[PDB]
Amino acid sequence: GHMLIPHDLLEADTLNNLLEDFVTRETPLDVRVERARHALRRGEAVILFDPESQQCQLMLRSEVPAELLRD
């Protein structure tokens, strides 16, 4: 914790950088990024934000503890 922040609230460049990080955490990069953007639209990937550190990370909902999806 770490809070959830909707992707559509994000500055476009920071979102692109988060998407690229995630898919590199063979299909071209851009295709993988588009698959991740769809996953964000379907709510099957989410973005976690840490108040201190002020850092963001894209994660699969399935890898997020329930405590951090209550929010």
Curated annotation (Swiss-Prot):
- Pfam families, per the entry: UPF0270
Highest taxon above the source species: Bacteria
Task: Spell out the NCBIfam families in the cross-references.
Answer: PRK00304.1
Q: Which family does it belong to?
A: Belongs to the UPF0270 family.
Descriptive protein name = UPF0270 protein PA3463
